[PDB]
Amino acid sequence: NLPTAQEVQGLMARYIELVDVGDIEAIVQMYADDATVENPFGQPPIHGREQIAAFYRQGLGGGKVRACLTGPVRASHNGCGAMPFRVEMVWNGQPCALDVIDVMRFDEHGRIQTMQAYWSEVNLSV
Amino acid sequence: NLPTAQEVQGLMARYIELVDVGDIEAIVQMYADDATVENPFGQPPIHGREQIAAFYRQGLGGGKVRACLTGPVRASHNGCGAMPFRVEMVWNGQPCALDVIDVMRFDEHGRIQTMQAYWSEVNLSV
Numbered sequence A, B: 001n002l003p004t005a006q007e008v009q010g011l012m013a014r015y016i017e018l019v020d021v022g023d024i025e026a027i028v029q030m031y032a033d034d035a036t037v038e039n040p041f042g043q044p045p046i047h048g049r050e051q052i053a054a055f056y057r058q059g060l061g062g063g064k065v066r067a068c069l070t071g072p073v074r075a076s077h078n079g080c081g082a083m084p085f086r087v088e089m090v091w092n093g094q095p096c097a098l099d100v101i102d103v104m105r106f107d108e109h110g111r112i113q114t115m116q117a118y119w120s121e122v123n124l125s126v
């Protein structure tokens, strides 16, 4: 919980950039060795870098996916933040957009220790 | 964890409407009797309707606080949702805005069991 509120905003905005460019390896480097991801929130967690890498490779490696912040990063003083963003993709030739909110907790080294993504079919658009 | 994702979106949007009008009575009844609120996230939890009512009583006090959703409510399938919104008030003279993200978990009765508000000074503008 060492990153400042300002640092958290920057780290979170960076993450979106890496997702937008699709640099799978740079995204995985942002996560702690033992990070846990819940995406979508409510599903069993993804534990560790190896499994976390598989998620991003499978989700971003495929077609063309774009991601943009749709509002400012809300940052707390205990190394946590939440951000609203939109993910654009094509599903079976159908152009789609998914609205998502990610909540992240960072460790003392500025690495993502926990990530939870809030979204469901209700957040899907065309 | 029983309201559907569509129900969560409705409940959360209603909450913003009540905050906007300042209906402190209706807000408190949205909460479970032993609910917990962490606002701002990082600060110690306020528990139970009495304490929660005090928060809204003093925060929305006079009636010069406006609140509006600034994007869709993201809802999961386990009774949780997260939403982006802006609060407008006055800092002893000059009008300012605060960008916040609320994450809420609902119970089998459609009542807010837990609420966490993400924000800090980095989200305050004049």
Ligand SMILES: C[C@]12CCc3c(ccc4cc(O)ccc34)[C@@H]1CCC2=O
Residues within 6 Å of the ligand: A019, A039, A059, A060, A065, A087, A089, A098, A100, A102, A117, A119
């Ligand atoms: C995996 C995915 C692309 C990336 C992505 C999704 C959902 C939530 C995300 C949250 C992130 O923080 C980063 C990327 C995604 C989509 C779900 C459907 C899809 O194609």
Ligand SMILES: C[C@]12CCc3c(ccc4cc(O)ccc34)[C@@H]1CCC2=O
Residues within 6 Å of the ligand: B019, B039, B059, B060, B065, B087, B089, B098, B100, B102, B117, B119
């Ligand atoms: C209390 C407050 C007005 C309402 C409000 C604030 C912060 C987080 C909130 C979260 C809510 O879910 C509902 C209302 C607020 C502001 C903090 C400074 C202020 O004037």
